[PDB]
Each structure stands twice: as C-alpha cells, then as structure tokens.
C-alpha cells in the first residue's frame, strides 16, 4: 500500500511505504482517533520472531543479509532464547537498537540528530551504586562544559519483572517541588509526588525554589537507594532578559541538561526498563512548558505584571506578549552561558529536512502531529503545516508505569 | 469500549459514553493515525433515515409514540414512492443544529443550539439563491453584533440538479497572479479568481477585492452576482499602540460564511448550505495574515517595529505575530463586531466540552484544529485529552464544482 502526506504550505506530496513495516498499535480504530490521548516476563514463544525480526533488521541496515553471519547470529539466538529463555545482544546491535529507537520516537522533534548518539553500555552493573557512577559519567560527558552531546546509558535488560533495574526518577535532573500546608507549591509542582518519596527514603530537602531532586536508584529488583548528584556536574543557566533588568530579579534559573530516565527500550523483543537518555533543550520546553504551565512555575502573571501590560481583559493578549519575553529571555540567557539550546523555529525547520530525508532514503519518518508542533506560535512553523502518519516502529521507547505502583518492598 | 479523557492541567477526567453511536469511519486504523491529514440508493436511505428520525423523536421526549412510528412509516412509503423523502421543518431545524453540535473541528460550539436556519429549499434559480445569501448576510452581520445562521438550499436528487454556492466563503477577498511572479490579494483565491474572470467578472485588480458570488442552481450552469457592498461589513486594521500600523492598509471582513460544504441529515444531503458564526481572532491575524501561503505580512511588521530580522532566536516572528494579533482583536472590538480571542474561545470550549459530556455522554473533538495556531499551551484546550469521531447530522467536505461541472 502506498500512503501520501502533503505540505500545505509548500503542497510538497511525500509517499510512506514505511508504515507496512509497523507492529504494534497506535489506539485508534475506524471508528475513533486518539491522537490526542497522552497515554493509550515475555515468553519465548513471543520472544523469538521479534528478535528474528530485529536481527534481520540490523543484518539488512550493515548490508549482511541472508549472510553466514546473519544465519549463524539467528542460530546462537535462537538456542540461547531455548536455552535460557531470553538473549544478550552485541554490543554493535545494541548501538544501532539504541539509535533506532530514538529514529522511531514519533513524538520527537530533534531526530535530525538520530545517528550522532553516544551509547554508553552499563550492562555489567549490578548495584545502586553502580548505577549512580555511570549515571555521573554520562550527565559529565553529556554536559561537555555546555557543549551539549546527546547520550544514552543502558542497564541491564528485564529478566522475570522481578529483579528490574530502574531510575525512579522521571528526569536525571529536576527541581524538587514542595506542597505547603496552605495549598501554595514551592518548587516544582510536576515533582511534588516523587520529591516526597524522596524525603521519605531519607532525603533532606533544603525546601527552596530551585533544590535539584537525588537520584533514586534501584538495582536488580532491590530497593532503591539515594544519591546526590555532585553539584559542580549540574550546569545551570540564570535566566535574564536582554532587554528587561527587572527580569533577573524574578530569581529563575533552569538546569542546561534535560535527561529523561524513566522510559523503556525495547529491543529485539528485549526490555532495559533503566535506559535515561538526553540531548539539547528546545526553548520552549522551559519558556512556554516549565516556566508557563498553569501546573508548573506559573509565571505568566508576574512577567506580565512587571511589563505592564493591560491584565483586565484576555483580549488584550497580555499571556501572549509575556510568554514571548519569557521565551527571549530563556533562548538569551543559554546562548549568553553558551549552553547548547534551540529555538522552536531553527528545530521544526530542522524536521522537516529530516522528515523529507527519511520518507527519500527510508520509505517514511513516523511522526506524532499532536507533539512535534510547538506550545507557541504553531502555525508560523513549518510543521503544523505538515501532514504527518503517526505509527509504531522497533526498536522503541515506550512508557512503562512508575516503580512506586508496582515495586515490591524488601524492606 | 466506554473510553476515559484526562484534562493534564486540572486532572478532570470524562467518560465517554457517546462514541458507541458513530458510523462513518476516522481514516484511522490499529496500525496507522492520520489524526493530522486534513481530507482523510432506497435500501441505504431508509436505514438513514430511521436512524435520524430515532435520535430526533428522543430528544423530544416522543421516542416509541405513535406519532414516531407514524413518521417512520410515512418516510418509508415515501422513499419507497420517491426514491427519497423531504424533512419536516422541525427536522431540518434539528439537523442543522445537531451538524453543527457534531463539528468534531469547531471550536465555537457552545453557540450550537443558538443557530438561525433559513430554509431556502424553495429556490429554484441562482438570482433566487443570490436572494436568499443576501438576507443571510444582512441578517447575520446585524450591524456588527454577529448572528449564527445557515441558509439550506434543495437536497441533492440525482447529483445532476446540484446546488452549489462555488465560493468556499461568501466573503472573500480575490487573488491575481501578477506578472511580477508575486501574487496580489489573497493567494488562497487564484484559481477561483479565475474561474470568475473566465465566466465574465471584471476584477479590479486590487488587494482587497470582495470576490463575486457564482452560483448554482438545479445543477444549471454557475452564474455570477456581486454582493451589494453596503452588506459586507469590514474592519480597517489599527494597532491601539503602534501608529503606523494603519499604513499597511490592512482591512479584513467581519463575516465568516463557510459555504463549500456538504449538510447530510437523514441521509439526505444539502450541497449548498452555506452558513456563518463570528471570527475567533487568531483566524485573521496568525493564519489570513501571517501564514506564509496567505497575506505573509510577518516581515514587514517586523522591519516597522525595526526587530532584529537577522536570528529566528530573536523570537521577531513570534513579537510580530502577537503585536499582529493584538490589533485584530483591537479593531474589531472598536468597531463593535463580534470576535473573540482564542483564550475566551477555548475557555468556552471546556465548559462546552463538560457540559456536552454531562449531559450527552460526549463531545467529538480534534485537537490538531481545536487548539489555537498562536500560544497553545496557554490556553486550556491543549491540555485535554479529546476522542475523534464521526457522528450525524454532519458537515462534510464535499469537491469543488468545476472539477464535476458538466457544462
Ligand atoms: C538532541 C536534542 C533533542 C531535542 C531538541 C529534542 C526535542 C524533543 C521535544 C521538544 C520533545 C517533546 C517533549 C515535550 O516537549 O514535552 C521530545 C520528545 C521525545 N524525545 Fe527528543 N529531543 C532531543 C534528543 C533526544 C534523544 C537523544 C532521544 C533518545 C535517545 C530522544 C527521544 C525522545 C523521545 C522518546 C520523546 C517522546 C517523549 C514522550 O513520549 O513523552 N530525544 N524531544
Ligand atoms: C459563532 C462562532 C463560531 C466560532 C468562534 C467558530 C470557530 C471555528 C474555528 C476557529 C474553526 C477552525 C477552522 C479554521 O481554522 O479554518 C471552526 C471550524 C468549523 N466550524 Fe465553527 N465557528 C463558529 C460558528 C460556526 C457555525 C454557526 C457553524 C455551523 C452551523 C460552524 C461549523 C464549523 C465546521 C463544520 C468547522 C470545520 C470546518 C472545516 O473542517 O474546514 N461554526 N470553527
Ligand atoms: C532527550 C530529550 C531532549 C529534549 N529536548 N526534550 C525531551 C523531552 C522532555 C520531557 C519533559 N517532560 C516530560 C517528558 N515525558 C517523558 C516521558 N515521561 C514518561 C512522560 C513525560 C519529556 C527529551
Ligand atoms: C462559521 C465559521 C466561523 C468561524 N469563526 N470560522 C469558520 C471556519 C473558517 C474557515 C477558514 N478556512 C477554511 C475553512 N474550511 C471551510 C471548508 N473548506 C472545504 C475547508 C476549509 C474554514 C467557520
Ligand atoms: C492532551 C494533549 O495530548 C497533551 O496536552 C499533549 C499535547 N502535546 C504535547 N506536546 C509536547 N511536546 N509535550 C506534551 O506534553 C504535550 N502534551
Ligand atoms: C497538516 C495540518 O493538519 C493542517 O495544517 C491543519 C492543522 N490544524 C488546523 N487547525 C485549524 N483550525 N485550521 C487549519 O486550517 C488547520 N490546518
Ligand atoms: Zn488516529
């Protein structure tokens, strides 16, 4: 089957031949679209074909297939998964894995940069402990003094469900977010469920606006143990205005390295439930998410304030002119810093170069619409002008649940 | 098969029980979304039919009565007769309402039980159906305080006697492809500006051209009418701030009047029924004014507020873009027409959401059009899990005319 998008802004017609290589579902039917819908221990009878499928993949991708090598790779896989019940993968395998997922993540906007990823290989941990050294080895190499590089580091793969290795934290770095007994938030209010577990596990919790969270960390199925991130590893920008002096005075900074930790990669039918990964920011996702979200710092009203602009009535577009300077002031204060960001403008530009590439060279590029347009601003972007077809591919990051409503305490 | 929708800034959740009762299909599968692709006989009719007539004699408290099966019974002898069957007043009223009720795209339906329907089906030639536009858009427009209303023109029989209003607008500006390789006017209008042009208008190569209606009747050959200017009421663009913003010589019009669509109610479906609300702002000022296939005046505005033009890192566009915004909204509302800025529009959308949930079990929604094309994080809509799905009475897509004319 052959399937078209247009551009209708350049009436640019490309053709996906890409999605018949999709797999899994995408929670929509003839009869309901979710595409807005944020969120819609494996035998070795489902286990094979899917590392089959993989291997043919990566066979195919270095130009080996139907190779000795490639019957041999499926042969010691195929008795390891009879053998043992599941399988290792190359090192070279779980490169490209790694890389993969990240080309097929259709809620990503920078994948321009899919093929440039470090893989760090964190399979031979065992501990907490452990798991803390290599995740301060990737957030230094990561950082590269704000130089940003983007990496993944892999723990060891799901064996029963019992004995999971995970990050229980959503992002590597994040601020703490405290609920006051007056209904007020300090900090962030994103992290206020987990920055209380934290102090539970044993945290103490400086209680100010910008505490950056410990990492929890639980190796092997065990209980997971604290760990502060060494500060002189947490790169943090200031945030001031170019124009606007009162704008430092807001008392804002936010971290230059966005890390998410709490993702599952699939691989070959494989699943590392412990697998943070990280990149560059987008301004948008301090500006207009972090800063703006009427769940998070919610400052819109005190910029808005300072500006003076007319408050009295919505017409007067006073959210929009304040979360513009905001977003000036964000993009600013990184490249000040020279601290790797980019603008919601240059990275949509960015996509739509990628996306032509991949439906030229790869049959399609899965992309999810509802998040790949920006909070701001959509339609003076090249991609909300873009049709899309969002579909799943493997290797994939998938959402998995959080530890805390399914681990088993040990004590 | 009851499906749940999250709202991430308040953590409301809603059932949606309503989804159950559609038909036509999304365009979706298990293995594809194309949730942003923007186009995704008396044996069928009966069906139809009685699926319409059930919900109508529901709503008004009468389902199972004597007078339903009646009815039922009636339509039937009646497309076993005609090969098709005509709506009651009543009916129709309802159907337009409820087509509109299930725009899963439109953000202003909490004005939907509140809609003027003109019954136009007694029209049988185009000077009859430039008539009944004209009271459509005098009625509408009201000197500025904006009505909601539909004009329905006869039903399709044999889809050689189509009505159709070949306009996708009533009101429109015109577009000219120049010989300097740019366009004047409104580059979304060239094609139609031409089909004008090659069936006898006189353009007066402006800018700002009101584009003449082309209508047609019966399935009868188009035929141009140019609208009484006196009735289009527009809105020269100032900026409350900015004084030289009136040189750019910006004006829009105050009536949005779709009128390319398609109106199946019972089956039966209305061609040509043109019909009108009142703008939300950023329809004017971020998409007929900055989109880059449309007026794309982002630049200049730019150079008047002397922005540093040279880093999209900068945000120009996005200054320009609000600063644009601003002034529709300002304009209009000093003009006293109808408009309302995308914040109290989305605002309205939730209530409308909740209440339609409540009330009916749900509310069809896409999110790629209901959220705003400036600031949509801001705004409550982008927060809100929203299900996609096909009810009827609807409105559809439907070709454009010349591509199907059979002169
Ligand atoms: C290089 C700079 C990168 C940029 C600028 C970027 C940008 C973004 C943005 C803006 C989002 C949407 C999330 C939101 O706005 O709330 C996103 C999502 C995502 N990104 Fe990227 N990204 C980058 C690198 C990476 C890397 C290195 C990976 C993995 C190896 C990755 C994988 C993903 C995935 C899986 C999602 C979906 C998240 C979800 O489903 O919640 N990205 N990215
Ligand atoms: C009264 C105030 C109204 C407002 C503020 C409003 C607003 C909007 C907006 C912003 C859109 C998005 C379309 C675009 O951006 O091009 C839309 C779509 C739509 N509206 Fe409404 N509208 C109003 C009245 C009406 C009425 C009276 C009807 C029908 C009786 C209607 C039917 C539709 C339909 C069918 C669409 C989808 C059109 C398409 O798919 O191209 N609207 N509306
Ligand atoms: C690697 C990377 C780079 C970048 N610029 N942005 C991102 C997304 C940031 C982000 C922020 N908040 C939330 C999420 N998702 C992550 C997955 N999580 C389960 C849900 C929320 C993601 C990731
Ligand atoms: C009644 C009404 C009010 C309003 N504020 N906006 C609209 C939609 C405006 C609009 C602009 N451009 C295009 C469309 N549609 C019309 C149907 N056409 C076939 C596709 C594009 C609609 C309609
Ligand atoms: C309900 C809706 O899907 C939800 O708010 C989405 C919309 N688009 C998004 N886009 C990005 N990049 N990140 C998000 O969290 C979201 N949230
Ligand atoms: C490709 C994409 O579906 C297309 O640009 C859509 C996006 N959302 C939209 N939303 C509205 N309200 N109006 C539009 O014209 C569009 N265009
Ligand atoms: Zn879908």
């Not at 819908?37 to 066979?59: G, N, S, W």
């Not at 209904?183 to 606006?209: H, M, Y």
């Not at 020279?338 to 240059?346: G, L, N, P, R």
């Amino acid at each position: 089957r052959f399937l078209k998008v247009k551009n209708w802004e350049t009436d640019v017609v490309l053709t996906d031949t890409l999605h018949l290589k999709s797999t899994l579902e995408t929670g929509c039917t003839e009869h309901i679209c979710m595409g807005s819908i944020m969120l819609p221990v494996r035998t070795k009878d489902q286990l094979f074909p899917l590392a089959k499928e993989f291997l043919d993949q990566y066979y195919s991708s270095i130009k080996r297939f139907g190779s000795k090598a490639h019957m041999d790779r499926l042969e010691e896989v195929n008795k390891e998964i009879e053998s043992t019940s599941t399988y290792q993968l190359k090192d070279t395998e779980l490169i490209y894995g790694a890389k993969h997922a990240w080309r097929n993540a259709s809620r990503c906007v920078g994948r321009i940069q899919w093929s440039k990823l470090q893989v760090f290989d964190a399979r031979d941990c065992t501990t907490a402990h452990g798991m803390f050294n290599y995740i301060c080895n990737h957030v230094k190499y990561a950082t590269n003094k704000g130089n940003l590089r983007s990496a993944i580091t892999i723990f060891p793969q799901r064996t029963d469900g019992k004995h999971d290795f995970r990050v229980w934290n959503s992002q590597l770095i994040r601020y703490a977010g405290y609920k006051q007994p007056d209904g007020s938030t300090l900090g962030d209010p994103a992290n206020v469920q987990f920055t209380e577990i934290c102090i539970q596990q044993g945290w103490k919790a400086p209680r100010g606006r910008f505490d950056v969270l410990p990492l929890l960390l639980q190796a092997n199925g065990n209980d997971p143990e604290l760990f502060q991130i060494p500060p002189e590893l947490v790169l943090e920008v200031p945030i001031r205005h170019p124009k606007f002096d009162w704008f430092k005075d807001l008392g804002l900074k936010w971290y230059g390295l966005p890390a998410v930790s709490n993702m599952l990669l699939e691989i070959g039918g494989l699943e590392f439930s412990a697998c943070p990964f990280s990149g560059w920011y987008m301004g948008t996702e301090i500006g207009v998410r972090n800063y703006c979200d009427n769940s998070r710092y919610n400052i819109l009203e005190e910029v808005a304030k300072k500006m003076d602009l007319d408050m009295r009535k919505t017409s007067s577009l006073w959210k929009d002119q304040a979360l513009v300077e905001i977003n000036i002031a964000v993009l600013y204060s990184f490249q000040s810093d020279k601290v790797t960001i980019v603008d919601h403008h240059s990275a949509t530009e960015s996509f739509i170069k990628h996306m032509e590439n991949e439906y030229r060279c790869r049959g399609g590029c899965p992309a999810d619409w509802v998040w790949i347009v920006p909070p701001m601003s959509g339609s003076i972007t090249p991609v909300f002008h873009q049709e899309m077809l969002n579909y799943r591919l493997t290797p994939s990051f998938e959402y998995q649940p959080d530890p805390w409503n399914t681990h088993v305490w040990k004590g």
